[PDB]
Coordinates of C-alpha atoms in Angstrom, one line a residue:
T1 CA 0.0 0.1 0.1
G2 CA 1.8 3.0 1.2
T3 CA 0.8 6.8 1.1
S4 CA -1.5 7.6 -2.0
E5 CA -0.7 10.6 -3.6
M6 CA -3.3 10.6 -6.2
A7 CA -5.1 13.8 -4.9
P8 CA -2.0 16.2 -5.1
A9 CA -1.3 14.6 -8.5
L10 CA -4.4 15.4 -9.8
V11 CA -4.6 19.0 -8.3
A12 CA -1.2 19.4 -10.1
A13 CA -2.5 18.0 -13.4
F14 CA -5.5 20.5 -13.2
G15 CA -3.0 23.5 -12.7
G16 CA -2.5 23.6 -9.1
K17 CA -4.7 24.8 -6.2
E18 CA -4.7 28.5 -7.4
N19 CA -6.3 27.0 -10.9
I20 CA -9.4 25.4 -9.3
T21 CA -12.4 27.1 -8.4
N22 CA -15.1 24.5 -8.2
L23 CA -15.2 20.5 -7.9
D24 CA -17.8 18.5 -9.0
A25 CA -18.3 14.6 -9.8
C26 CA -21.3 12.7 -11.4
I27 CA -21.2 9.0 -12.1
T28 CA -18.6 8.8 -14.9
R29 CA -17.3 12.2 -14.9
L30 CA -15.1 14.5 -12.7
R31 CA -15.8 18.1 -13.4
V32 CA -13.3 20.8 -12.5
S33 CA -13.9 24.4 -13.1
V34 CA -10.6 26.4 -13.5
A35 CA -9.2 29.9 -13.8
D36 CA -7.0 29.0 -16.9
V37 CA -7.7 25.9 -19.1
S38 CA -4.1 26.3 -20.5
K39 CA -2.7 25.2 -17.3
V40 CA -4.5 21.8 -17.3
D41 CA -2.3 18.8 -18.4
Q42 CA -4.9 16.8 -20.5
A43 CA -2.4 14.1 -21.5
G44 CA -1.2 14.0 -17.7
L45 CA -4.8 13.3 -16.7
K46 CA -5.1 10.4 -19.3
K47 CA -1.9 9.1 -17.8
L48 CA -3.3 9.3 -14.3
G49 CA -6.6 7.3 -15.5
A50 CA -9.1 9.4 -17.3
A51 CA -10.6 7.4 -20.1
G52 CA -10.9 10.8 -21.8
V53 CA -10.9 14.5 -21.2
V54 CA -13.3 17.1 -22.7
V55 CA -12.8 20.9 -22.2
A56 CA -16.1 22.8 -21.9
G57 CA -16.4 26.4 -21.1
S58 CA -14.3 27.4 -18.1
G59 CA -14.4 23.7 -17.1
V60 CA -12.6 20.6 -17.7
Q61 CA -14.6 17.2 -17.6
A62 CA -12.5 14.0 -16.9
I63 CA -13.9 10.6 -17.3
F64 CA -12.6 8.6 -14.5
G65 CA -15.7 6.4 -14.4
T66 CA -17.1 5.1 -11.2
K67 CA -14.1 6.5 -9.2
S68 CA -14.8 10.2 -10.2
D69 CA -16.8 10.7 -7.0
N70 CA -14.0 9.4 -4.8
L71 CA -11.4 11.1 -6.6
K72 CA -13.4 14.4 -6.3
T73 CA -13.6 14.0 -2.4
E74 CA -10.0 13.3 -2.0
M75 CA -9.2 16.4 -4.1
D76 CA -11.1 18.7 -2.1
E77 CA -9.7 17.1 1.2
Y78 CA -6.2 17.8 0.0
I79 CA -7.0 21.2 -1.2
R80 CA -8.6 22.3 2.3
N81 CA -6.2 20.2 4.6

């Protein structure tokens, strides 16, 4: 096991804490509102497990399947604490 660093890795892929303004997850998607889409590493998100990544407005949606809700929660926890 060890210590998971998935939350910080995802936050880094999305451009860092200063780039994230909102976090939401559905059943198949992780929706992250960002201040700057150009700071998001779409390829990095796929390497992290995203089946696909779509830029829609000031948001980036990443398909992490059934894990989406869990990653969302871990991201918020890492951002807050």
